[PDB]
Symmetry: C4
Subunit: 277 residues, 4 copies
């Protein structure tokens, strides 16, 4: 209705970064992932895998102490900030991170919002997902704030009912990205990527294989990693959403759309990303 353009293959190809011979892991930065609670532990593994697959140099996972042992055997490349999402409620971040994500597998509590307030004082891009998504405003800061709501979370954030939202997804996403001065990745078929400067795109990739628990956690991780290897954070977000969807399309070539598990998106990404190089 607003003729929002698709972020196409051509755009992805033109903007994906090189990983040059003369680089070291510092070139690609350290990401912080604040995710996973004793009650919802898997989200940290999913987002962790997505992040480390997506071109960062190092990952620190600030998860609950009891979640750490669940990640290690699957993602032994990650390091930890023990009870980090909880500690961030109380402490300013001491360390410098290339990018931060908070919220997958975290409860919708006031302490999580305290952590969010502290995350927002760093200079880097920050992603808020899942339990970090609330009805609130955001402080003026340097780096972008990227919100990743599904339609129900968008309702929690705005009071726009899901049935109204779905009739005018790009119009609402654009309006609220402007009002909040945040990026909004409004999930669903034809995910909307709305920027606070008024740019907006639709994602052309993906299918119903994604309509299952965990695929959003994987996407948050993918955005986090891509923020570390792209110079332009806008391109990071757009490429992450695109490639995430593309992985589901590769899956359905030889596998039923009913049968995908989110972690497999991460396993598919290496070959899918190669195709766009």
């Amino acid at each position: 209705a607003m003729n929002v353009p698709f972020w196409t293959e051509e755009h992805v190809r033109a903007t994906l970064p090189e990983r040059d011979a003369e680089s070291h892991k510092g070139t690609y930065g350290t990401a912080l992932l604040l995710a996973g609670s004793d009650d919802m532990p898997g989200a940290a593994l999913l987002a962790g895998l997505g992040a480390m697959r997506s071109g960062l140099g190092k990952l620190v996972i600030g998860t609950s102490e009891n979640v750490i042992p669940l990640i290690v055997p699957v993602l032994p490349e990650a390091t930890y900030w023990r009870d980090g999402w909880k500690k961030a409620a109380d402490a300013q971040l001491e360390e410098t991170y290339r990018a931060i994500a908070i919220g997958p597998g975290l409860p919708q509590t006031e302490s999580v919002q305290q952590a969010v307030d502290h995350v927002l004082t760093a200079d880097c891009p920050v992603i808020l997902d899942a339990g970090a998504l609330a009805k609130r405003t955001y402080p003026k800061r340097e780096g972008p704030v990227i919100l990743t709501p599904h339609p129900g979370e968008f309702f929690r954030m705005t009071g726009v009912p899901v049935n109204e939202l779905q009739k005018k997804r790009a119009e609402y996403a654009k309006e609220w990205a402007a009002q909040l001065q945040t990026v909004i990745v409004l999930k669903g078929n034809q995910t909307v990527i709305a920027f606070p400067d008024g740019d907006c795109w639709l994602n052309p990739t993906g299918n119903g294989a994604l309509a299952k628990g965990g695929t959003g956690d994987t996407l948050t991780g993918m955005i986090l990693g891509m923020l570390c290897c792209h110079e332009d954070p806008k391109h990071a977000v757009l490429n992450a959403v695109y490639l995430h969807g593309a992985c589901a399309e590769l899956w359905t070539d030889e596998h039923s759309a009913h049968t995908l598990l989110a972690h497999e998106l991460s396993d598919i990404l290496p070959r899918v990303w190669k195709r766009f190089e």
Copy 2:
């Protein structure tokens, strides 16, 4: 002897659901799996994997607290109800589920039957397996109750000795499905799927690769997921049994029937299901 028809490839093809572009995980529902105990933990992983592979939107696993960490690294897409099968002995279910399964890896105790009585007060289809199978009757309710006994469990449920049962499997399955007003999936070579309205089918797929611990737990999970993505729960049961067997047949093309592990059925399902689309 009763000329029970086979649920054939043609029937599977005609009844498997589409996963359309405009869907979200809510379309495909949340399943509850009440399974796995400290003493028999693996059943929860097997049934969990089968369920999430089989087209549901979300899975909540109500397992023993000490089992949770064993599932997470393999199935990070699942969420949990801590000690859920035990809590269900005491509590009415508060939440609405698309479908429920109870029993894999659970002991044959009175408290498990208390949990079963509570599960039966929800409106959705319910599967009872393994330790949830007992000599008992069932209350009139909306959704179907699906019992998944092997011949020894059928003896526990009915007093029909296994040696007599095996001479007349479909006749006994049909008779007892009618008497109990439950679906009965009577396992074995040529698994019988008997409905309480008198419909009955045989399953034409599978082989002796299935004759090993865990393959029934996988099947319970597969039924659970398929109940979430099929509109007709009868077709869900029949397709789950069929596809489960078909996975074992794909296995034996290049692998010895002596060497299958149940979890691999779940790993095979994505490609097998595609073939029937």
Copy 3:
């Protein structure tokens, strides 16, 4: 020197069992594996995987309590006897098993020999490996006792020094199998399988990829499973040793012999066994 015959492909093909359509897991029996200690936990996973891959119907692992959680995510098809190898020091076995193995990952202690004495009172074939191997004699019983020493363990058992043993491996293996009235699988290149009735064979398969920790634990498990699906326990032992070696040969077709991990033998077995059907 004694012209001991090789157990050849032809012999394997003629003796491997069918897994027929009309079977159930009971047909193929329940095995008990008494293995794995807090100090040497991996042996239980390796032997467990080998056993469940090798045609049994059910596996009960009697391992240390703290080892159980390490097995479940890899082998969720196994069930447990908590602290079973320790409990067997004190208790007669109550249950009937198709076959039993004891010793992988267990210490060389008197309590382990107490467990061995109790295992030997069951009627089934029994395998003794690793910490269960000691200088001792064996009581007259029905089923065979199968000892699986490497040359150093054979020295512990007999006082034959390794340097003398290695000059006359089949002569010593045959002599001691007769003296002890046990089967002796004397490991190494050209593994000797010596029976107490005087039959003896050499194994023609395998290579130096096997010369690394864990491959013997895998073999013990393979013998355990094959004892469950072969009518003739002699053929079970001989086929297990043969197929174990054959898996290492398949590996080295496209992978360096320096790089095999024991668990991969179990992963290779499905395709290797198919070739001999």
Copy 4:
């Protein structure tokens, strides 16, 4: 600038060892890996996998007690020295090892240096990495000491700033290998392998896929294993560095360089090593 030669394919082919038919795991020795702490557990899994993949006979991992359970399900072939890196601060090594590595995932503390002093009293080659790298000297002993610093660790060791180091990498590596009488593997694009007798080579393999956390831990493990199967420890180091890089090059044939996880290098090595045989 100093015309340092590359360690080429031809050199690798001429020096890689055979794994002969008549070998046993003792032929290839027992390695000790002192790695992994509660705070940095993954390094032990990465280095463990690299070591066991690289032609040793047995591996003992002296890791923190709470790390052990994280390794077992992935590497069940390893055995353990519980809290071994900590115990080595206090105890002379009692056992004889073919080679030792210390430091991946260990903190930069005085107690770790105490452990290093004890490790250095064994006769075998020893690798120091990560937290074991400090500004210090080394005692005259038989076997080589192999330091594996990245440029920041080289600064910690020498006071040569990273920006100066990077202009003259081979000159600084050679100078400091001579001064310390240690091997120095100075990591980065064109890794420098400097020997204390003045030999020095550059590594021609690898790419930016390696520029991510964990790949150095994998390399330490690879050196450790190769020290066990090569007669000449110089060739072990050079081949480990070469093959590690070659694995990343194989990866990038069909996968994006941004998406490699360190553990996959270990999974690739079997096929890559075969190519050089």
